[PDB]
Amino acid sequence: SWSKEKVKINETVEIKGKFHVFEGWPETVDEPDVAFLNVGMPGPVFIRKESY
Amino acid sequence: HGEKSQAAFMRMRTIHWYDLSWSKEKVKINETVEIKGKFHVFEGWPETVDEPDVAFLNVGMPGPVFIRKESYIGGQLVPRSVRLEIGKTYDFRVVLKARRPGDWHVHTMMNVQGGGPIIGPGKWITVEGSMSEFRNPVTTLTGQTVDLENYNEGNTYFWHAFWFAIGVAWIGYWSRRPIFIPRLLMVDAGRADELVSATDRKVAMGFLAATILIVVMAMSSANSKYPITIPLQAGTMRGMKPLELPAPTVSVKVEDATYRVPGRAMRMKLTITNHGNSPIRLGEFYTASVRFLDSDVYKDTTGYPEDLLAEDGLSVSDNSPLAPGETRTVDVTASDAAWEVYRLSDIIYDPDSRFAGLLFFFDATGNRQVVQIDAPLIPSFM
Amino acid sequence: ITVEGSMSEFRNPVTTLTGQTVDLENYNEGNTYFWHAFWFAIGVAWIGYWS
Amino acid sequence: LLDKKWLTFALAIYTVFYLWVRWYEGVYGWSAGLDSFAPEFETYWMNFLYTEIVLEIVTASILWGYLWKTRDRNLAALTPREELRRNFTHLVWLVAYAWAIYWGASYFTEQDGTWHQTIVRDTDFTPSHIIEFYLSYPIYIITGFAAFIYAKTRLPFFAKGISLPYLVLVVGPFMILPNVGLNEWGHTFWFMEELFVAPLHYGFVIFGWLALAVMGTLTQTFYSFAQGGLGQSLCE
Amino acid sequence: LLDKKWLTFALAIYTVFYLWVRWYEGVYGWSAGLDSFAPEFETYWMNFLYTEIVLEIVTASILWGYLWKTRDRNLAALTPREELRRNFTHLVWLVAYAWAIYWGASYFTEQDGTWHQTIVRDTDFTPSHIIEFYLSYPIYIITGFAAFIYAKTRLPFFAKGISLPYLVLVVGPFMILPNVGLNEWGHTFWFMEELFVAPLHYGFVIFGWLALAVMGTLTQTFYSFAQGGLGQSLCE
Amino acid sequence: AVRSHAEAVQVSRTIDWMALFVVFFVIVGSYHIHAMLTMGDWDFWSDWKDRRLWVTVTPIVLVTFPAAVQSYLWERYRLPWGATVCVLGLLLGEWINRYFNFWGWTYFPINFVFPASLVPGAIILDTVLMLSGSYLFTAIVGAMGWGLIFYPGNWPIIAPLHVPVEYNGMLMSIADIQGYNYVRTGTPEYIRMVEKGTLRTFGKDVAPVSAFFSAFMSILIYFMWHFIGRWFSNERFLQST
Amino acid sequence: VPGAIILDTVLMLSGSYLFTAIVGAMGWGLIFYPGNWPIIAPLHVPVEYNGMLMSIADIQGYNYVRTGTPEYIRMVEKGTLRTFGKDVAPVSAFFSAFMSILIYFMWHFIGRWFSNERFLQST
Numbered sequence A: 001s002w003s004k005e006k007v008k009i010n011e012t013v014e015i016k017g018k019f020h021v022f023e024g025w026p027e028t029v030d031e032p033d034v035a036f037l038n039v040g041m042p043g044p045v046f047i048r049k050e051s052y
Numbered sequence B: 001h002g003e004k005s006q007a008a009f010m011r012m013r014t015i016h017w018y019d020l021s022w023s024k025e026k027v028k029i030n031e032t033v034e035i036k037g038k039f040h041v042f043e044g045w046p047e048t049v050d051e052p053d054v055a056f057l058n059v060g061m062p063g064p065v066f067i068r069k070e071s072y073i074g075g076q077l078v079p080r081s082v083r084l085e086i087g088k089t090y091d092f093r094v095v096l097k098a099r100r101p102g103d104w105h106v107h108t109m110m111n112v113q114g115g116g117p118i119i120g121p122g123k124w125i126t127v128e129g130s131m132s133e134f135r136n137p138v139t140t141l142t143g144q145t146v147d148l149e150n151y152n153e154g155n156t157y158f159w160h161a162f163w164f165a166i167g168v169a170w171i172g173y174w175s176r177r178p179i180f181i182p183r184l185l186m187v188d189a190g191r192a193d194e195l196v197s198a199t200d201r202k203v204a205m206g207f208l209a210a211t212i213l214i215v216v217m218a219m220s221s222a223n224s225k226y227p228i229t230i231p232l233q234a235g236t237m238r239g240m241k242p243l244e245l246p247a248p249t250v251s252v253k254v255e256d257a258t259y260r261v262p263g264r265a266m267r268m269k270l271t272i273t274n275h276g277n278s279p280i281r282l283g284e285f286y287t288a289s290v291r292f293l294d295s296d297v298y299k300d301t302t303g304y305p306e307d308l309l310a311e312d313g314l315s316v317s318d319n320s321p322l323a324p325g326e327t328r329t330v331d332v333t334a335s336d337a338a339w340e341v342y343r344l345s346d347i348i349y350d351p352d353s354r355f356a357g358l359l360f361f362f363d364a365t366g367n368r369q370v371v372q373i374d375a376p377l378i379p380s381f382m
Numbered sequence C: 001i002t003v004e005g006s007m008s009e010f011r012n013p014v015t016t017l018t019g020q021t022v023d024l025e026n027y028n029e030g031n032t033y034f035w036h037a038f039w040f041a042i043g044v045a046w047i048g049y050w051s
Numbered sequence D, E: 001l002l003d004k005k006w007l008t009f010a011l012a013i014y015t016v017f018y019l020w021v022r023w024y025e026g027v028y029g030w031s032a033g034l035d036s037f038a039p040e041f042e043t044y045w046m047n048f049l050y051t052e053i054v055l056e057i058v059t060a061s062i063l064w065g066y067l068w069k070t071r072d073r074n075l076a077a078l079t080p081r082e083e084l085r086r087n088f089t090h091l092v093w094l095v096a097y098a099w100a101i102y103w104g105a106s107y108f109t110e111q112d113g114t115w116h117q118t119i120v121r122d123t124d125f126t127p128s129h130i131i132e133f134y135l136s137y138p139i140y141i142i143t144g145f146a147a148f149i150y151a152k153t154r155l156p157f158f159a160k161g162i163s164l165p166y167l168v169l170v171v172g173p174f175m176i177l178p179n180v181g182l183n184e185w186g187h188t189f190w191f192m193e194e195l196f197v198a199p200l201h202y203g204f205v206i207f208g209w210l211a212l213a214v215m216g217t218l219t220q221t222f223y224s225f226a227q228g229g230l231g232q233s234l235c236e
Numbered sequence F: 001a002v003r004s005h006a007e008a009v010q011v012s013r014t015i016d017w018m019a020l021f022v023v024f025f026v027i028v029g030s031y032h033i034h035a036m037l038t039m040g041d042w043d044f045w046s047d048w049k050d051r052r053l054w055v056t057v058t059p060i061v062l063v064t065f066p067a068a069v070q071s072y073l074w075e076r077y078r079l080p081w082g083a084t085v086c087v088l089g090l091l092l093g094e095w096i097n098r099y100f101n102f103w104g105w106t107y108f109p110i111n112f113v114f115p116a117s118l119v120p121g122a123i124i125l126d127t128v129l130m131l132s133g134s135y136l137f138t139a140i141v142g143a144m145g146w147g148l149i150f151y152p153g154n155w156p157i158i159a160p161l162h163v164p165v166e167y168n169g170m171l172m173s174i175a176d177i178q179g180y181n182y183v184r185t186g187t188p189e190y191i192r193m194v195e196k197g198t199l200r201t202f203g204k205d206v207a208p209v210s211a212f213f214s215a216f217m218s219i220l221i222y223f224m225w226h227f228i229g230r231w232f233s234n235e236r237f238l239q240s241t
Numbered sequence G: 001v002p003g004a005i006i007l008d009t010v011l012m013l014s015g016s017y018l019f020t021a022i023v024g025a026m027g028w029g030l031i032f033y034p035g036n037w038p039i040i041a042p043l044h045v046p047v048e049y050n051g052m053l054m055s056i057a058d059i060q061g062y063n064y065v066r067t068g069t070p071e072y073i074r075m076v077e078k079g080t081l082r083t084f085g086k087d088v089a090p091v092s093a094f095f096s097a098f099m100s101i102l103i104y105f106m107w108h109f110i111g112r113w114f115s116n117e118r119f120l121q122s123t
C-alpha cells in the first residue's frame, strides 16, 4: 500500500506491506542472514525518514 | 567399492541407510532395477564434514554399467544437488537401466559438497546380454526422438576432424620447405626476411579469413538447425520433504561401549526403557552398513548382502520381552567377521573414537521401532 | 580462590588402558630430555669436528 | 651410416611395452583391481608395483652407470663425421625421451582421470597409480637422464658445462614424481572432491611447464649438429 | 693490545640488565601486572614503559651523535695496526649487536608467547609488551645502528659508501618495531585467536629474514680485516 | 662433416623430422598435463561445457603454451605455427585418451566425453603473429581473437546437446540428461562449475560477457607467457649444479 | 638435528646444490616424524578418561589450562572421508618432503642475494 500518489516537498509518503522469504531460496544467492531494507529510486529524490 | 578405506568413525556417523531393497538381483540389457530405502542424517555430523547443504544422490558402480534413469528423494526427482537437514530421515528411490554385461557391485551413495562420498551398502547385481543391445531413447520438446548412445556423435567427429585437418594443413604448408636448421641459421646470420615472403602472407591471410568465415557460417548454420536451445540446467534443490516418523517409545542410554583389539566384536552396555504399551525385544544393531541381527527376534527377508549381514551376530544378555514401563540394563555384543572385513576395527587408528548406530526393537505384533545410539567407543587391549 | 600448600605436593596420576599408572607432572620428562640432549650433542659434535 | 635403426627400436620398445601395459590394465582393472583390500589385488597389482619399482631402480642404475663409465675421455680428438653420428644418436635419445614423456604425462595421466570419475579411491596405490605414478613417470625420468648423460659424455658441445635448458628439461618433469606427495595430501586432508582442476594438482602443472625448456635444449642440439657438419649447403 | 676487554663488558651489560629485567617481570608479572586497569599496574609497568622510552631516546641520541662527531676525518692516514684494532672494536660492536638481537628476537619474543597462553590481553601494553616491544627491540636497534655508524666512521673499508648488507642487517630488524602496528591491528580487528602462526605475525617474519644479511656483512668485515693485516700467514 | 651439398640437405631433412617429433610430443605431454590440471573437468563433460565457466576459463589457461612456443619458434626460425602445433598436440592427446580410455577402458560415450575445439583460435594467433610480426600486436589482437572465437567455434558441436527435453517433469537439456544418465561416481552434480544465474546477470548476455572477459585475460596471460617462453628458450651453460 | 645433519652431509658429499635441494631436502622432510617418534610415542598411550578415549598428550592439554589457546584453535588431524588411518603420517611426510624441495630451492637463492657485498653510493 502507498499512502499517497502525489506529494508536495517536505510531505511524507508511507509504503507498507508484507514480504515472504521463499523457502526454495536459490543456491546462487546467499541466505538473507544480512539484509537491508532499501528503497529503489533515482538518487535521493526522497529521503528515507524511517523504515521498519 | 570405495569403503573399507574411509575412517570407521565417519562411516559410523554420517548417514544410516536402512529399509534397503533391490527389485532384482539379475537383469537383462535394457531392463530396470529399482533400489529403494531410507537414510537418516546423523545428528552428530562430524565437524570435518560440511553439513549436507549441497548433497547429490549418486550411485556407486564401476562406470556406467547401469544408467541412472531416475532418482528420488522423498517422492520427487532429484537430477541436481539437494539440501538435506541434519537429523532428518528421507526415503529414496533410484531406477537403473542395465547397460553392460557382468557382475557389478552397486552402491547407493551420497556426495556432500564439502565432505566427500558417503557410500551405502553395496549389492552384487548380475547383468546378462550384450552392450550392443542397449538403447537410451529420449524425446525432446522439439518433437524428435534420439538415442543418447550415439546422438551427435557423427557431428562431433566431423567438426573435430575438420578443424584438426585445417591445423595440419597449416603446419604442412609450412613444413614442405626445410624447417629447423637452415631457418635457424638464416635468422641468426643477418636478417632473415627471406623465409617469410609472398605468397606466404597471402596464404596466412587466406587461412585467417577462412577460419573466421567458417566459424561464423557454422555458428549461423547451427542456429538455423536447432533453433530452440536452452542453457545447461543447474542449481541446488531446496525443500526436500523428509519422513515424518513417529517418536520412538523406547529410550536407550549407552552406559560404556568397548571393543577388543584385536577382535571381531563390539560390546556395549545399554539401559533400555520401554514406554508405550507393548513388550519389545531388541532385534537388530546397525552400525555402518553392517546389520547385527538376533535370529530369535528378527530375520531378514529383503535379500540384504550376505557379507554385510550377521544373522546371529547380535547377542543380548537378557533379550526377554521388556514389559511397558520397565527399564533394565543389558550387555549387548555385536560380533561378526564383517567387523574386520569392512575394517570397522580400524577405528583405533581414527582421531575420534566415537560410534553411532541404529537399534531396531520389535514387539509381539511385529511392528518395529528405530532408536539411535552414539557413545565413545573404548578399545580394550588386556 | 586461595590455594594453600606447596607446588611440590601436587600429583596428577592417570591410569592408562595399558595398565600403567603415571604422574602427568613428570611422565616422559627424562626421555624427552635425553633425546633432545643426544641430538644436540650430535649436532655440536659435527660443528666441533669442523671447528 | 649416420642415423641408424636404433630409432625404430626406441619408438617400438615404448609402444609395445605400453600397449601390453594397457592390455594388462584393461584385463585386471575390474576383476582383481577394483578392491584394494582383496587378496587378488595384492597379487595382480601390488606385486606389479614392487616388481616395477625394483626393475626401475636396477635399470636406472645400470643404464646411467654404463653411460658414465663409457664416457669419452678424448673428446678433443673426435672427427666431425663421428660427431655427426653421435649427434644423431643423441637425437634418437631425445626422440625416445619425447615418446616416453608423451606416454607418461599425457596418456596415463589422463587415463588416471577416467578412473577418477568411475571409482571411489581406496588408497594411493590404485591400478592407475601403479601404471602412471610408479611406472611411466620413472620410465621417462630414466630416459631423460640417460639422454642428458649421453649428451654430456659424447658431444663436445654439451661437455664443458651443464646445459641449463637441458637440466631443466630433465629435472622439472622429474619433479612431478615427488609432486605425488602433494597429490595424495591434496586429496586426503584437502579437496575430497575428484576435481581435476583443483589447486592440489598445480604441482604437476608448475613442473609440467619446465618441459618447455625443450626449446632451449633443441636449439642447443641444433648448434651441436652445426659445429663441423653444418654443411656446406646450409647457408649457401 | 689489539682485542681488549670491551668484549667482556659488551656481553656482561646485556646479560646483567636482561637478567634483572627477567627477575623484575617474574616478581611483578602477577601481583601488579595482571590487571592493566589497576593503579598498581600504572606504577609498576606504565612507569617502566615511560622511563624506558625516554632513556632509549636519550641513549640513542647520545651514542649515535657521539659516534658521528668523533668520526675519523683523516681515514687515509691510518696505520694497518690501528686499522686492525678498529676492526676488532667493530667486531666487538657486532658481537654486542648479535647478543642484543638474540635477547630481543628470541628470548623476550617467545616469552611474549608463554604469556599468550595464560592471560587474556587487556591492552597493547601488557608487561611482556613493555619488555619485548619497547625495551629489547629498541635496545638491539640502538646497538645495530651504533655498530653501523662505527664501521662507517672508523673503518676505511666501510667508508666511501653505505654497505647494502649492513644497511639491510641494521634496518630490517628495525622494521619489526614499526611492524608492531600490524600485530595490534592483526589481533584486534583480525584473528581474535591467540594463534602464534597467524599471517598477522608474518610482518616480523619477513623482516626477521633480513637479518640474514649478517652473512654479507660478515664477509665484508672479513675483507676489511684482511686489507693490510691479512697476514702474512694467511694464504701462506 | 658431410660429403656433399646433397648429403647435408638430406641430413637436415632427417633432423627436421626427428626434431619435429621431439617438439610435438614433448609439447603434447607437458601441455596435456597443464590443460587437464587447469581446465580438464570442463573438457571432460558435455554437461560441464557451459556458457560462463567453460567459456571464461578454457582460453585463459590454454593460451599459455601457445604464447611461449610462439615466442620461441617465430623468433628463432620464423615458423608461424607454435600455437597450432600446441593446440593440435593437446587435441591429439585428449582424443586418444577419450577414445581409448574414457570410451575404451570405461564405457562413457564419445558424444558425452568429447573435448573442446581450439584450432580456430590457434590459427588466429598464428596468422596474426606472422602478419604484423609484432608480439605486442599479437598479444593484444590475436589473444583477443583466441578468447572470442572459442565459444562460436564450439557451438556447432554442442548446439545439438542444448535441445530442451521434458525429463520426468523437469526441464533438461540433452547434455544434462547425458550427465544424469551416465553415472560418474567420482564427479557428482554439485562439483559442476557451471552458470547458475545471479541477481546481477542477464540470460542472453552470459556467453558474450564471458567471452570478452576471457579475451582480456588472454591478453594478460599471453603477455606473461611470451616472456616465460623467452626464458625457457635460453641456452646458458651453468658451470655446475 | 637429524634432518639438519642429512641436509649438511648431502651438501658436502656431492657438492651439487641441486642434488641437495632434491635429495637432502627430501630426507629433511621425511626424517622429521621418525626422528621425533621416540619422544612423543609415550604420550600417545591410550587412556580411559571419564568415559572418553584420550591419549596422554590430550589429557595434558585438557588438564594444564591454556587461557589463550582453546581446543578448537588446535590444527590437528581430524579425519576426513578421503583419508586412511594408518597412512596419514607417511602421506604428510612425503608432502612435506616435496614442499621442502621447493622451499629449499627458493631460499638458496634468497640466501645468495643476502650474501651480496654491494656498496650502494647512498640511501
Ligand SMILES: CCCCCCCCCCCC(=O)OC[C@H](COP(=O)(O)OCC[N+](C)(C)C)OC(=O)CCCCCCCCCCC
Pocket (backbone or CB within 6 Å): D013, D016, D017, D018, D020, D021, D024, D043, D044, D047, D048, D049, D050, D051, D052, D053, D055, D056, D059, D060, D135, D138, D139, D142
Ligand atoms: C625403466 C624400467 C622399468 C621397469 C619396470 C617395468 C614393468 C614390467 C611389468 C611388471 C609386471 C609385474 O610386476 O607383474 C607380473 C605379472 C603379474 O600377473 P600374474 O598374476 O602372473 O597374471 C598373469 C599376467 N599376464 C596375463 C600378463 C601374463 O605377471 C607376469 O609375470 C607378466 C609380466 C610380463 C612383463 C614383460 C612384458 C612387457 C611388454 C613387452 C615389451 C617390453
Ligand SMILES: CCCCCCCCCCCC(=O)OC[C@H](COP(=O)(O)OCC[N+](C)(C)C)OC(=O)CCCCCCCCCCC
Pocket (backbone or CB within 6 Å): D036, D037, D046, D049, D050, D053, D054, D123, D124, D125, D126, D177, D178, D179, D180, D181, D184, G084, G086, G087, G090, G091, G094
Ligand atoms: C624397496 C623397493 C620396494 C618398495 C617400494 C615402495 C612401494 C610402496 C610401499 C608401501 C608400504 C605400506 O605400508 O603401504 C603404504 C602405507 C599404507 O598402508 P596400508 O593402509 O596397509 O595400505 C593398504 C592398501 N594397499 C594394499 C594398496 C597398499 O602408507 C601410505 O599410504 C604411503 C603413501 C605415500 C604417498 C606419497 C609417495 C610419494 C613418492 C615420491 C617418489 C619421488
Ligand SMILES: CCCCCCCCCCCC(=O)OC[C@H](COP(=O)(O)OCC[N+](C)(C)C)OC(=O)CCCCCCCCCCC
Pocket (backbone or CB within 6 Å): E013, E016, E017, E018, E020, E021, E024, E043, E044, E047, E048, E049, E050, E051, E052, E053, E055, E056, E059, E060, E135, E138, E139, E142
Ligand atoms: C637502549 C637504552 C635503554 C633504556 C631503557 C632501560 C630500562 C631500565 C629499567 C626501567 C625501570 C623503570 O622504569 O621502572 C622503575 C622501577 C619501578 O618499580 P618500583 O615501583 O620502584 O618498585 C621497586 C622495583 N625494584 C625492586 C626493581 C627496585 O623502580 C626502580 O627504580 C628500579 C629500576 C632499576 C633500573 C636499573 C638496573 C638495571 C639492571 C643492571 C644492569 C644494567
Ligand SMILES: CCCCCCCCCCCC(=O)OC[C@H](COP(=O)(O)OCC[N+](C)(C)C)OC(=O)CCCCCCCCCCC
Pocket (backbone or CB within 6 Å): E036, E037, E046, E049, E050, E053, E054, E123, E124, E125, E126, E177, E178, E179, E180, E181, E184
Ligand atoms: C614522549 C615519551 C613518552 C611516551 C611514549 C609512548 C608510550 C605509550 C603512550 C600511550 C598513550 C595512550 O593514550 O594510551 C594508548 C591508547 C589507549 O589508551 P587507554 O585505552 O586508556 O589504555 C589503557 C591501558 N594502559 C594503561 C595499559 C595504557 O591507544 C593505544 O592503545 C595506542 C596503541 C598503538 C599500538 C601500535 C604502536 C606502534 C609503535 C611503532 C614504533 C616504531
Ligand SMILES: CCCCCCCCCCCC(=O)OC[C@H](COP(=O)(O)OCC[N+](C)(C)C)OC(=O)CCCCCCCCCCC
Pocket (backbone or CB within 6 Å): B212, B215, B216, B219, B223, B229, F051, F124, F144, F145, F148, F149, F151, F152, F203, F204, F205, F206, F207, F208, F209, F211
Ligand atoms: C578476430 C576475432 C574473431 C571473432 C569472431 C566472432 C564470431 C561472432 C560470434 C557471434 C556471437 C553470437 O552469435 O552471440 C553470442 C553467443 C552466445 O550465445 P548464447 O548465450 O550461447 O545463446 C545461445 C543461443 N545461440 C545459439 C543463438 C547463441 O556466442 C558468444 O557468447 C561469443 C561472443 C563473442 C562475439 C564477439 C564478437 C564482437 C566483435 C569483436 C570485436 C573486437
Ligand SMILES: CCCCCCCCCCCC(=O)OC[C@H](COP(=O)(O)OCC[N+](C)(C)C)OC(=O)CCCCCCCCCCC
Pocket (backbone or CB within 6 Å): F204, F205, F208, F209
Ligand atoms: C577495439 C574494439 C572494436 C569493436 C568492434 C565491434 C564489431 C561488432 C561486430 C558485430 C557483432 C555482433 O553483431 O554480434 C555480437 C554478439 C551478440 O550476441 P547476442 O545478442 O547474445 O546473440 C546474437 C545476436 N545476433 C545474432 C543478432 C548477433 O555478441 C555480443 O553480445 C557482443 C556485443 C558487444 C560488443 C561490444 C564492443 C565494444 C567496442 C567499443 C569501440 C569503441
Ligand SMILES: CCCCCCCCCCCC(=O)OC[C@H](COP(=O)(O)OCC[N+](C)(C)C)OC(=O)CCCCCCCCCCC
Pocket (backbone or CB within 6 Å): G006, G026, G027, G030, G031, G033, G034, G085, G086, G087, G088, G089, G090, G091, G093
Ligand atoms: C634419507 C632419507 C631417510 C628417511 C628415513 C626414514 C625412516 C623410516 C621411518 C619408517 C616409517 C614408518 O615406520 O611408518 C610411518 C610412520 C607413521 O606412523 P603413524 O601414522 O604415526 O602410526 C603410529 C604407529 N607407529 C608408531 C607404528 C607409527 O612414520 C611416518 O609417517 C614417516 C614416514 C616416512 C617414511 C618414508 C621412507 C620411504 C623411503 C624414502 C624414499 C625416497
Ligand SMILES: CCCCCCCCCCCC(=O)OC[C@H](COP(=O)(O)OCC[N+](C)(C)C)OC(=O)CCCCCCCCCCC
Pocket (backbone or CB within 6 Å): D053, D056, D134, D135, D138, G086, G087, G090, G091
Ligand atoms: C626416488 C624414489 C625411490 C623410492 C625408494 C623406496 C624405498 C622404501 C624403503 C622401505 C620403507 C618402509 O618399509 O616403510 C614405509 C612406511 C610404512 O608406513 P606404515 O605402513 O604407515 O607403518 C609402518 C609399517 N612397517 C613397520 C611395516 C614399515 O612409510 C610409508 O608409508 C611410505 C610407503 C610408500 C613409499 C612410496 C615410494 C614410491 C617410489 C617410486 C619409485 C619409482
Ligand SMILES: CCCCCCCCCC(=O)OC[C@H](COP(=O)(O)OCC[N+](C)(C)C)OC(=O)CCCCCCCCC
Pocket (backbone or CB within 6 Å): F128, F131, F132, F133, F134, F137
Ligand atoms: C598504431 C597501432 C595500429 C595497428 C598497427 C600495429 C601493427 C604494427 C606491426 C609492426 O610493427 O610492423 C610489422 C609489419 C611490417 O611490414 P611492412 O614491410 O611495413 O609491410 C607494409 C605493407 N603492409 C601494409 C601490407 C604491411 O607491418 C604489420 O605488422 C602489418 C601492417 C598492416 C596492418 C594490418 C596487419 C594486421 C592484420 C590483422
Ligand SMILES: CCCCCCCCCC(=O)OC[C@H](COP(=O)(O)OCC[N+](C)(C)C)OC(=O)CCCCCCCCC
Pocket (backbone or CB within 6 Å): D167, D168, D171, D172, F236, F237, F238, F239, F240, F241, G017, G018
Ligand atoms: C621452478 C623455477 C625454475 C628454475 C629456474 C631457476 C634457474 C636459476 C639459474 C641458476 O640455476 O643459476 C646457477 C647458479 C650457479 O652458477 P654456476 O654453476 O657458477 O654457473 C656459471 C654460469 N651462471 C652463473 C650463469 C649459471 O646458481 C647455483 O647455485 C646453481 C643452481 C642451479 C640450479 C638450476 C636448476 C633448475 C632445475 C629445476
Ligand SMILES: CCCCCCCCCC(=O)OC[C@H](COP(=O)(O)OCC[N+](C)(C)C)OC(=O)CCCCCCCCC
Pocket (backbone or CB within 6 Å): D064, D145, F241, G010, G013, G014, G015, G016, G019
Ligand atoms: C644423474 C643424477 C644421478 C645422481 C648424481 C648426482 C650427483 C652429482 C653431484 C656432482 O655434480 O658432482 C660432485 C662430486 C664430484 O666428486 P668427484 O671428484 O667426481 O668424486 C668421484 C668419486 N665419488 C664417486 C666418490 C664421488 O660427485 C658427487 O656429487 C658424488 C658422486 C657419488 C654419488 C653419491 C653421492 C651422494 C650421496 C648421497
Ligand SMILES: CCCCCCCCCC(=O)OC[C@H](COP(=O)(O)OCC[N+](C)(C)C)OC(=O)CCCCCCCCC
Pocket (backbone or CB within 6 Å): E167, E168, E171, E172, G118, G119, G120, G121, G122, G123
Ligand atoms: C624487503 C625487501 C628487501 C630490501 C632489498 C631491496 C634493495 C634494493 C637495492 C637498492 O636499494 O638499490 C639502491 C639504489 C640507489 O643506488 P645508489 O645509491 O646510486 O648506489 C649505487 C650502486 N647501486 C646502484 C648498485 C646501488 O636505489 C635507491 O634509490 C636507494 C634505495 C636503497 C634502499 C635499500 C635498503 C633496503 C633496506 C630495507
Ligand SMILES: CCCCCC(=O)OC[C@H](COP(=O)(O)OCC[N+](C)(C)C)OC(=O)CCCCC
Pocket (backbone or CB within 6 Å): D019, D022, D023, D024, D026, D027, F096, F100, F104
Ligand atoms: C598413440 C597412442 C596409441 C594408444 C592406443 C591404445 O591405447 O590402444 C589400446 C586399445 C585397446 O582396444 P582394442 O584395440 O579393442 O584392444 C583391447 C585390448 N586391451 C583391453 C588389452 C587394451 O586399442 C588398441 O590396442 C589399438 C592398437 C593401436 C596401436 C597404436
Ligand SMILES: CCCCCC(=O)OC[C@H](COP(=O)(O)OCC[N+](C)(C)C)OC(=O)CCCCC
Pocket (backbone or CB within 6 Å): B113, B114, B115, D190, D191, D192, D193, D199
Ligand atoms: C592460483 C589460484 C589458487 C586458488 C586457490 C583455490 O581455488 O582454493 C580454493 C579453496 C576453497 O576451498 P573449496 O573450493 O571450498 O573446497 C571444497 C572442498 N573441501 C572443503 C574438502 C576442501 O581455498 C583454499 O582452501 C585456499 C587455497 C590456497 C591456494 C594457495
Ligand SMILES: CCCCCC(=O)OC[C@H](COP(=O)(O)OCC[N+](C)(C)C)OC(=O)CCCCC
Pocket (backbone or CB within 6 Å): E019, E022, E023, E024, E026, E027
Ligand atoms: C642465555 C639466556 C639465559 C636465560 C636465563 C634466565 O632467564 O634466567 C632466569 C631464571 C630465573 O630462575 P631462577 O634462577 O630460579 O631465579 C628466579 C628469579 N627471577 C624470578 C627473578 C627470574 O634463571 C636464572 O636466573 C639462572 C641464571 C642463568 C644465568 C645465565
Ligand SMILES: CCCCCC(=O)OC[C@H](COP(=O)(O)OCC[N+](C)(C)C)OC(=O)CCCCC
Pocket (backbone or CB within 6 Å): E190, E191, E192, E193, E199
Ligand atoms: C602466506 C599465506 C597466507 C594465508 C592467509 C591465511 O591463512 O588467512 C586465513 C584467513 C581465514 O580466516 P580464519 O583463519 O577463518 O580466521 C578465524 C578468526 N577470525 C574470524 C577472527 C579472523 O583468510 C583471510 O582472512 C585472508 C588472509 C589474507 C592473507 C594475505
